[PDB]
Amino acid sequence: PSIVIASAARTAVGSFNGAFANTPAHELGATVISAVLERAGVAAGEVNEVILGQVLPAGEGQNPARQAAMKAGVPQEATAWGMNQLCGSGLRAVALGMQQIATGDASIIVAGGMESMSMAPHCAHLRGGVKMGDFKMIDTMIKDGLTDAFYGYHMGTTAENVAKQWQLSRDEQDAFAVASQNKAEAAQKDGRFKDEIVPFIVKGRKGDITVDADEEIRGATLDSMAKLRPAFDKEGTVTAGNASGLNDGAAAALLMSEAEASRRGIQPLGRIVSWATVGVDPKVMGTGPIPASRKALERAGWKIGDLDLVEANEAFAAQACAVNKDLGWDPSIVNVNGGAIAIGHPIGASGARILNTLLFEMKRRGARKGLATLCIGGGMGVAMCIESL
Amino acid sequence: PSIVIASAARTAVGSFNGAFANTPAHELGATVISAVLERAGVAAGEVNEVILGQVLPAGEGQNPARQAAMKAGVPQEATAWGMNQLCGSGLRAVALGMQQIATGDASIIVAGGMESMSMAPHCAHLRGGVKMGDFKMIDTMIKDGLTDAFYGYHMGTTAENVAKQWQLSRDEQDAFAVASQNKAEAAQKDGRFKDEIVPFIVKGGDITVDADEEIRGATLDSMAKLRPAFDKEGTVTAGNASGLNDGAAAALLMSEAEASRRGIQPLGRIVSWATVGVDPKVMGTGPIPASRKALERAGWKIGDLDLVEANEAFAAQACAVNKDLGWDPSIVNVNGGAIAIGHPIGASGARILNTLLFEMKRRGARKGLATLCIGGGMGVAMCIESL
Amino acid sequence: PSIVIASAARTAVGSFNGAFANTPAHELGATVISAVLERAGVAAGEVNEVILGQVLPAGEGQNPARQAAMKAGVPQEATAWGMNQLCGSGLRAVALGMQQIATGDASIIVAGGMESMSMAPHCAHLRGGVKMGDFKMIDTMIKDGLTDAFYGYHMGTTAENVAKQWQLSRDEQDAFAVASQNKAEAAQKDGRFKDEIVPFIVKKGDITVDADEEIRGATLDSMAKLRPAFDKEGTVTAGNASGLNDGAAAALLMSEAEASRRGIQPLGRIVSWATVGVDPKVMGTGPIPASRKALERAGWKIGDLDLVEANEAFAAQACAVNKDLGWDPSIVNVNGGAIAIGHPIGASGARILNTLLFEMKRRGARKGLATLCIGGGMGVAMCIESL
Amino acid sequence: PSIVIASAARTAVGSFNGAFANTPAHELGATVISAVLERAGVAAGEVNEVILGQVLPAGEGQNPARQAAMKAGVPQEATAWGMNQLCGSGLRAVALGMQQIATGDASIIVAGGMESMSMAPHCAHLRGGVKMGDFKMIDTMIKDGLTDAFYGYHMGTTAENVAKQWQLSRDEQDAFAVASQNKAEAAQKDGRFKDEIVPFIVKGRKGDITVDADEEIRLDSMAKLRPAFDKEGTVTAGNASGLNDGAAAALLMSEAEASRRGIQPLGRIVSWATVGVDPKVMGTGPIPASRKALERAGWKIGDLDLVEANEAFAAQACAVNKDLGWDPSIVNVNGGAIAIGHPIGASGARILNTLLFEMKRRGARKGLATLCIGGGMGVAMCIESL
């Protein structure tokens, strides 16, 4: 069975406590569900299921994937669920939605991810009761999203471990970070993000604001980048500049069979050729994309040289340089419009976010074979091969 | 692509703030992952992926499904993820794990659910800052698990709406609840839950928990003396409604040809599954179209079923599903239901799948069905056939 | 037993979450204690006791009055304690310190008040444990400072009761608030706040705060366009009511004979004081019997007063006090009031005492009076005479 | 300038999360305000002001002293305010109420203290907002009542320094605690606390309970405890005071006022004193405070017939007794805070009740009450009957 991506859309990536500071994730997810339906000419009443990845849904209510589907007009007869594979959630949900059609259980699937790291609350177990002494209010964003559960340190420390084995210097990681900021700024100026971004209306206060530009894209320098202090180790190289940030946003895609798209006259954004997920050492979780991409290319019958465009998520400059050095693909075809260092990193949605950038760049330049991949906390990776029609 | 369930296991369903009061969900899930591996003769190094449903993972850390797999001995080369479809999470994860092997992406899958409603913390968004005035510390169990996000009332109110449309009286719902408590107690005394339950060691003295803590029985005189917990003039009480519980349940999945090569005798063959949505006001009706679509995909009729496990979230919704589908009530929840056993949201789907599989084996039933109602107006069902 | 005020000082009144957003109250109190010692030529080693009023000391540690005295250089041999009479705390502490010397128990007293409404935390009793459901994190500023403990509503509702009984229209309360804003705005430019305000160094960079941050410019047209903040059909708005503020204020007290030996010329002599209770429903009427009894103890008439400082908690309450005593409104709050300057509850009593004392010196006034209304239905007043 | 105490009363000292677990402090204060009025035959309408010490009033509402007076029947014409001198709050409020009548500003004063350490909440400053990272929920009982603001450690560590410099051994503190525990049980069994304790009606969901007995009153079971503040320390949970709830107050008027009303007073306030000491050794506070009180009264240590020295810690209590040299057989003859309890806001007035009612039954002429104060302070007051 051949499954294609009929359409795709994403919101602008908002800053931490920025444009989407008081916007729940399902509200961002509802906008993207409506957009992928409008861009493909498919009504909300035709959706069988909505599958949205989300890592931090605490305090948002019962099944935020169902809340986003309801507000987008998807009828009550359909189903909706969320899933959590950390940073690979947004891309895995696309593969999960693909399998719904491959097994014959659904026809039209809206798959992607949504995340509101700004709305992540502080929690504390209080049922037993704190009779005496102080107790900690746990940040769910740090605890459930950014801290390794086996070794106890942040995901930035894992980038320090990757920097040690590959011997990646501070100046090399800053050169990668500056390159990402300059490619993302150039892509924003030329309007290459307009096709994939759907505007979001932030209701509240006294005026309604339309958000249609990635809020982190502002540019940077090499003199101001090397003056930053390391945020994870006193003698480390990972700083706040060469590492991805905390962001809000959503991204999704409309899935259907290749024969179904031909019957509707739809021109798909690409054909899902294969996907893969593999685990690695949690100490070097940034290496996830290395075996995940290899297995994805092996299942597709492709070689590394056959790829025309690559979207490798830039969780950290240290891990991103390590993946490129091992796979050896042409770095000029990897993240041609910037990466998460400049655009942002909403964990649950980034998987579908970089899939949107991959699909719309493959369309404008005429690329035939593409690949998207991300590293996953806890020692995992996920990749997917896309081919045009 | 024929997918079988080689083995299955579950922990005892613990009471709210009971035996598993301070036990994280992944610790319960790790025991069940190790159990389904031992009962099938499959090593942890052969597992491709672990898929665990969970609704309330707040405060437990990065990806509790990966934490349960790692502690169970599953190597780092494998993958693991969690999913949330509320009450149908435990059963959907089995269907999701089945699709991993059906599409050729994996060979060995551990799929199920785990939930620790006792460890659910209180949360509050404090990044923007509370300029002035009081703010509420939100119970994540109530908000993210038991409160409808569209109408704002508890899941017990949705059972009241089902009771109005089907005209189910207070005494009729209590008779269903008392029958559920007495069937579960008889099954516990006769030892029918021992095959499916794997013991759990509560570290701290070490205590071995191998009996469902909610299974104690009840009467009709003490059941009709309870006050309604959701409406002053309502019929749903704490006795005829499911409780708050902790536990885990999973199963080992592989192809039918893979089981034949390993000499494993599977617990059953996954014939079909289905999930459908309904109105959030009457979410308990989910099992009605979900089971029908599941039977249609399997090519079966309601009369063809030999055993049925329909989760008892509420006596009102459970009576409505049986009255609508019309299946023989003597083959439905023969060993009791969630009213007596308990209702761990993330694990209940796989919990009742364990009860179905091990009862189909002891009595020799050939065609079975498991179904649950889902908050927000959904249902999920799966058809199992023996080999 | 003649007790005089040798010197006095206060910090600038900061806005809510403004310059003193992250500054504890005892840090503000230390500056005013050191300032009143420096302005009188009295060493810290001569202080017997420090009495600082404070309403919201939660989370600041053991006895913030002791923290402010020690940080101001007062040696450990001295004593320090805090007291809470709500809005009259700052002025009552001055009267309490006066009684310490009158009874022969002390010689040198630093008395005043301090309040940090921005540093007021949210609290919740959690020892028993929250089994299930949401619980409120109580804002101690609202509960312990701005909410009546007997009727449950804000102090603005009590101002509505006074406004209804006196038949005060919105435009009449609107005209008094604008007059208060215009007198305070003129005082900031004319430098009348320079003598009483001591700069405070906010220890991102050190910032010197020496101007009242709440002092804003208003008119009569933009003032009537505001919405009522306490009742949909009310008259009290955010413009005609006092604001939320931080600050500190204190004074150095000693006997008249003690000042003559040290060459200190006091700002005034404490002639009498009084405190009386009223109905909590109309707590704004407190200053009316408190000032009259204070005048009775002093042997003075209303016409004998040259300057009056009546705290402006609300425009409704402030107009009611002026109408009853009948004193010349041109000698009442000549430099503005709490509506424009601000209202740090614990410090407001000593705050308006600084404005009174330094104004009697600048214009040559002989007889002065300072009074405030107190939540829960009380009032406090003090009569000051020059030398 | 003679001020007498016409009557006095107190509630039973409750255990931490015990009988008064869900009882606000002003409710305990209301009972004692009504009790001192009934025992003296004085109407609530004659009270000028109520002065109640309290250390932990967070979450209780505007001015709990005003809340306690209003429910106790004191009319709105009176005034009420609270004050905080930590452990000396309850006794200082009596001295503050004495000064109100001495200066001619009031005639009838109800002065004492109240504390509900069980109802003390956890707090956290959240107006600025926690952008990132975990933050601590601060226990207001520990931080605002039991933690030194200058050195950052618990009040029990200050007792270790008093034990270190005075060289008080582990066995020395246990002998003082057992003597304190045995005297309090003997006084409770003999009914020696019945005159001073007023019952409190605890209303609740399942039943109303009448609390009129000290719940904390209870070497082999005593010497098996571990030190609670230092691994190499001497202060344990047995030889240190606990966390308690309760209230205590007194009715104040002039000696001529008591003679005119036919009231026979419990005693005359002769003098008082407050002095500061080193915060590191706050337990030494009562030593110069008692001497200064006796000097102003013209008395010597040998003239005292009864002494009430607060037992915050066995180490600090032993140091005061050894230096002042008063007869230990007349000090806390009915037990101390180690066995009875230590409600911070109420403890000052709590030990004043025990002194007044013991001086009356045994015929003592001159008595003394004193307590140590956190942050390096002390307070003492001399009372003599007529």
Ligand SMILES: CC(C)(COP(=O)(O)OP(=O)(O)OC[C@H]1O[C@@H](n2cnc3c(N)ncnc32)[C@H](O)[C@@H]1OP(=O)(O)O)[C@@H](O)C(=O)NCCC(=O)NCCS
């Ligand atoms: C590293 C991290 C803690 C940053 O902390 P932060 O709160 O966001 O603080 P900022 O990002 O605003 O950076 C702070 C400083 O660096 C400067 N800075 C940041 N990025 C810069 C850039 N790209 N160029 C130049 N200067 C920069 C900022 O201006 C600021 O200066 P300041 O101190 O005067 O305010 C946070 O981004 C993080 O946790 N990243 C990791 C996310 C993650 O692990 N995701 C999962 C990966 S698998």
Ligand SMILES: CC(C)(COP(=O)(O)OP(=O)(O)OC[C@H]1O[C@@H](n2cnc3c(N)ncnc32)[C@H](O)[C@@H]1OP(=O)(O)O)[C@@H](O)C(=O)NCCC(=O)NCCS
């Ligand atoms: C019903 C519910 C509100 C109960 O909350 P609760 O406050 O803990 O009520 P309790 O568990 O304390 O039980 C109440 C009383 O009924 C009695 N009781 C309970 N079950 C009984 C039974 N089966 N037989 C006889 N008496 C019983 C209990 O002993 C208790 O007595 P008590 O008054 O001394 O406490 C809660 O379990 C709930 O919300 N369940 C629904 C969850 C849900 O929605 N599930 C479906 C998801 S779609």
Ligand SMILES: CC(C)(COP(=O)(O)OP(=O)(O)OC[C@H]1O[C@@H](n2cnc3c(N)ncnc32)[C@H](O)[C@@H]1OP(=O)(O)O)[C@@H](O)C(=O)NCCC(=O)NCCS
């Ligand atoms: C009344 C009160 C609730 C105001 O709360 P607030 O919302 O923070 O008031 P704000 O200043 O932030 O907003 C008031 C509005 O009116 C305007 N406004 C307020 N004061 C003004 C003034 N003095 N002149 C002109 N315009 C003014 C503001 O610009 C604002 O408009 P906006 O919302 O569009 O920005 C608060 O000041 C209060 O609690 N007062 C009573 C305190 C008290 O009880 N003290 C004890 C008395 S015994």
Ligand SMILES: CC(C)(COP(=O)(O)OP(=O)(O)OC[C@H]1O[C@@H](n2cnc3c(N)ncnc32)[C@H](O)[C@@H]1OP(=O)(O)O)[C@@H](O)C(=O)NCCC(=O)NCCS
């Ligand atoms: C002394 C203090 C530190 C001990 O608190 P605690 O450690 O929580 O003691 P607990 O509440 O747990 O009492 C229960 C325990 O003590 C044991 N215990 C208590 N009292 C006992 C007694 N009288 N005899 C024997 N055993 C006793 C119990 O068996 C139980 O055992 P555990 O220690 O293993 O838990 C505490 O009461 C305190 O902080 N007091 C403050 C005193 C103070 O500073 N006052 C102000 C000075 S100016």
Ligand SMILES: [Cl-]
């Ligand atoms: Cl293995």
Ligand SMILES: [Cl-]
């Ligand atoms: Cl297989």
